[PDB]
Structures are given as C-alpha cells and as structure tokens.
Amino acid sequence: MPAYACQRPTPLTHHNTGLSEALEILAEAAGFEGSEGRLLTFCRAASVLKALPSPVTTLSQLQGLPHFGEHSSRVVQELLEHGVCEEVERVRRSERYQTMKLFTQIFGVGVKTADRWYREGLRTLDDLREQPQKLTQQQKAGLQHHQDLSTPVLRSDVDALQQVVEEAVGQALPGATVTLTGGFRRGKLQGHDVDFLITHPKEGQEAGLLPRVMCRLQDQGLILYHQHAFERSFCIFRLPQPGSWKAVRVDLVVAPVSQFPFALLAWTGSKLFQRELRRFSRKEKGLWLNSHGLFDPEQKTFFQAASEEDIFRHLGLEYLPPEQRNA
Template structure:
C-alpha cells in the first residue's frame, strides 16, 4: 500500500497570467529582489522570465515596461545571468548605473540561471549553493596600473597562448576578408589590432580596457564591443558564412595559389576544387602539385614530422658539406606544436663553402624519392653593398632557396603509422618544405626574418624605418643616414643595434 503524501497547501500567491497594476502588491518574498541581466539573455527572454517570476511571487527590478533603460537599485539582492562570467555581470551592472556592486563578499549575490530555474520549480527562493554562484576574480591592479602597451610588436612579448582568443579570432577573420577584397591597408589595421590583444597579460572585458591601447581603430572597437556584449559579432559571422569568403579561403589553401588567382577563379564562377577540374582551369606546375596533394598539405604538420624532415635534410647536407648546419625556423621555433609547413635554414661556418650546396642537396633528395615537387631559385645578390638591397625593405630574400613538397616517409613516420595500425606504404605524407641556404655572416638576419611571426617581422621593419632610420631585411641591417651596414653575430646583437630589448622566439607570436 502506498504511503500517503500530504497534499501541499496551495499558495495564495500563485495566480494566473494577468499581472497586477503594481507588481509589488503580489510579492511573497519581500526580502528577495531579483535583477535579470539582459546581456546574452536578450530582451524578449528577459521579459518572459520576468513575468514568470512575478507570477511566482518574486519581486523583479529593472523591467520597467515604459522604458528601455535598466537601472538596478540598491534594493537588488539577487542578480541572475545566463551565459556570462561574474566579471562580465559586474561590468554590465556598472555600465547600467548600479552602485550596489562592491568588493568581494558585498553587494548582491551573482547567480547563474540555474538558481532561477530551480527557484521557479520550487515556487520559492532555493538555498544558494556554490554551483549557483558566479565567481568574480579580484584584480589588484586597476586599468591605470596595468603595464603600458608598446606601439610596435617587436617591443612586446607575445606568447602562443593568450587571454583574448575570441576577440583576436574575429579580428583576424576581418583581416583575411579585407585581403581577399584587395584592401591591404584595412587588412593590416585589423591584424595590428589583433596583434595588440594577443600581447595583453589580461582579458579584455569592456571597451574601457582598450582606452590606453595603441593600434585599435574604430572598426576594430565596434567588433570587439559586439563580441563582448553579445558573444559574437554579426558582421564577422556574416563574413565567415559568405560564399566569397569561404571560396577564397578554400582556393588560397592550394599551394601556389594567391589572392589574385583565387579572385579571378571566383569571378569566373568557380567555387570548388571539383569546379577547377571540371572547367580545366589553367594551372602552373606548382598549382597542379598543390591540387594533387591538397588534403595532405592542409593537414597539420607535427613537431615530430618536422624533426624527421630536419634529420633527412641534415643527412643530405652532410654528404656534400661536412660541418654545415640545418636550423628549423618558422612557427616551430616559436614554440608551435603543429604548423602548415617546414622552414629550414642551411649554413656553414666557413663563408663561401655554402655556394652550390643547395643544388646538390636537392638532386640527392629527388633521387631518393623525397621530393614530389620542387622549384629552386639562385642567389641574385651580387654584393652586400647592392644599392637596391640597402634602401629597400621590400627586398626580403635573395638567397639560394627551394620551395618544395616533401614526401615524408622517414622511419619515425612509418613507426608512428605502425603504432596506429596502418601500413608504412599508406603513411607517406606530402609536406610543404622551404630550404634556404645563407652565408654565415648573414645567418642571424635570415634566422630573425624566417622565424616570424609575420606581424612581428612587419612591425620590426616598420620600427627600423620610422624610429631608427634603418632598413632591415633577411640579409643585413643598413643605416640610411650614416650609410653603413651593421654586422651582427647573433639575433641579440641585431636587437642591440636597434636599442630594443631582446624578444626570444617563443615570445614573437604577434
């Protein structure tokens, strides 16, 4: 026999949908005053939840039907939010005129929507537990007390992992779209704004945090504000979903295809790789190879794969020039665990011994079946005093170099495949590899230039030109007023010439 369950006495304060003229006449819990945060919740949902709470006998402030303004008062005891952090709720309340947000332990309770829904189900305020609470980190430093952010990326430490991923992702999408549209200046503006945010040791939570930052233009600020307030930018999402952006992004991932070629294909009505094949688009050798190995070339290259390639190239180099070194640069030198390609610098401590080395190395690699495609360029630098080199920052690289698609089939890679249960024959992978041979005296400049990041290098050259009256490229550093070349035995010495604090590679991820 089932035990009898006493029937709950029906509360008198639980009427139907019609709201009284004065909501407070219907309050059952006078010690509880709710505030529903509209940010991310939205106006219509907040109105619905407000009506629900009032029907249950709760007092809700800040929902004046005759005004769109939200003015939470000192009476508020419970602040309820959906999808926001504690810091975001505090900032939102301050912006909306609340003076009841105090230090930790004071002011109203900051609660997740889960407390609200449980209270509505119970028909009364439930006990506040830890899982209901939004935590607020107490920052000892004020905005004014934070470190000043330098104007140039080469003056800032920028680690791989930073605190503003969502904001920088939105800005970088806009930078990419601007480049696809042929607006390089606009693209640079978005890139520089993203670069600044990457260097910040704190999380941007409001537009006030941007007040003292360099390089954040009005358009970037609007996008940042949208992301902060709504969790996403409608403009950025429209760009990401647009056919043009997706098509351009798809085509420019093909090895050998730049923005100009991708734009022409788009204008011709082509949208996919299948379209390129069906319409017999005219492709050069690099593009044909890129199309053939598209999937491999757009899958991440791991550190172990990059190191396997270094070992193969080192073996080839040693056969023709004992004592030569092979240095892994690019994103891997900056600490990345994966990348899109592998950049290698080759040099020898005896100046001049490196001449002719690249052609021998490439021939050997090709004969051993390591190369699926390669295109070599001979050193066109006649002398370091070349006038064009000394006055142009655009002349970035005139070394012996080879842009190739490498077939990764080293023992390391095959061993990894065996561990994964696949045969070695199916584990060969196409990888983009750039080989550059540099004279020993120019190696520090080449190492600095090929390490990146792109924004770091761009700002470093801009700093040289504007602040130091110098020209820096992958070959040398030239003082335009004194008309002298400045030699350096290391990256550190280059920074010293420029009067800059040395930034280690792992902090150059601008």
C-alpha cells in the same frame, strides 16, 4: 602598450583568443579585397590583444590601446555583449570569403589568381580540376596534394624530416648545418610546413649549395614537388607514416654565415612581427632591415651582427626570444 609589435612580448597562447580570432577574420577578408592597410590594422589590433596580461572583459579596457578605433572597438564590444559579432559572422558565411579562403589555401594560388577564378564563376576544387589546362605546374601539385597539405604538420614529424635534410646537406657540403626556423622555432606544436635555414661556418662555402641538396633529396625519392642557381626552395616532401606516407610542405633557405643572424631573425617570424620590426627599423631608426642585413643609408654601411641579440640591440629594442615573437 607600445604601438609596434616588436616592442612587446607576444606569447603563443594568451588570454584573448576569441577576440583575436574575430579580428583576424576581418583582416583576412580585407586581404581578399585587396585592402592591405585594413588587413594590417586588424592584424595589429588582434596582436595587441595577444600581448595583454589578462582577458578583456569591459569596453573601457580598450581605451588607450593602440590600433583600437571605432571599428575594431565595435567588434570587441559586440563579442563582449552578445558572444558574436554580426559583421564577422556575415563574412564567415559569405560565398566570397569561403571560396577565396579555399582557393588561396592552394599552394601556387594567391589572392589575385583566386579572385580571377572567383569572377569566372569557379567555386570548388573540382571546378579547378575539371579545367587543368588553366593551371600552372605548381598549382597542379598544390591541387593534387591539397588534402595532405591541409593536415597539420606535427612537432613529432619535424625531427624525422630534419634528420633526412641533414643527411643530404652533409653529403652536399660536410660541415653545413641545418636550423629549424619558422613557427616551430617559436614553440608551435603544429604547422602548415617545416622551415629550415642552412649555412656553413666558413664564409663562401655555402655558395651553390641548395641545388646540390635538392638533387640528393630527389635521388633519395623524398621530393614529390620542387621548382627544379637558387637559395630558397619551396618543396613538397614525402614523409613516412605507419604503413604509408604523407605529403608535407618543406621550405629550405641557404644563407652565408655572415648573414645568418639576419636570416634566422627573418625566417623565425611571425610574419606580422617581421613586418613590424622592418617598419620600426625604417620609420623610427632610419635603418633598412631585410633577411640579409641592416643598412644605414646615410653612412652607407651594413651592421655586422653575430647574433639575433646583436640586432635587437642595434635597433634599441629589448631582446625577445622566438617564443615571444608570436605577434
């Protein structure tokens, strides 16, 4: 078992679901406390279990696995022996965990804002609604639409959205393309949002595109919230439903075609997969990876990729299709 998540296939569904979920609770709780390092270790341990070919049944099966030391091994031991880990259950029912989870789930609220509200005594969404002067416009939208945004987006919903985005994109710049990215590209059947990547085959034509797309979607009555020269948009869309509609989060990113492989890689995820890939690139290969390119800081050159396959090859990694990037 390699130490980096980008060195091993991780399927969406696997054989250690309960164990990985427990470790991910501890990872989330570590993030609520500001402990990025412990969040990373618990996430990495969870992801190792997702990559295994069969269920862990005995503690000895953790020996030699990366990211399993005394703490994560103890968690697994207790789940195997008793079906429950006392530390995990203590987190799950703690007021701090439940409130931070509730607040950070709001679009426009991160850990720092959630923690400040917690320390001020706030505990519920109605507590926030009663003092709307303290909310940004983004947070007001997140709070108004919170119920709809809490319901999973269905893969059945995604086709209809992609069609309306393509219509606006085609009027804004004929020949521009729309690619589904994020979790749905990795094979997920549900999601918290829909992520799209937009480009054009002629380098440079994509400049200035996203404002033109957003204006056209807003004119068609489809935008419930957006932030407005930009290249990323984090929107709330009106999605039709039988006799009505629902609010859905939609992310749009524009990239030049020269950067498209890097952008596709970066926005397909998973989040942990990309963090691990960027860490691998920098620490093992001495190359700096981001959503725009791959930089050799010694030669001061960028690697010209024509595909995701090119990028894996330049990093000396076996190619993983999106469905195996579910770290």
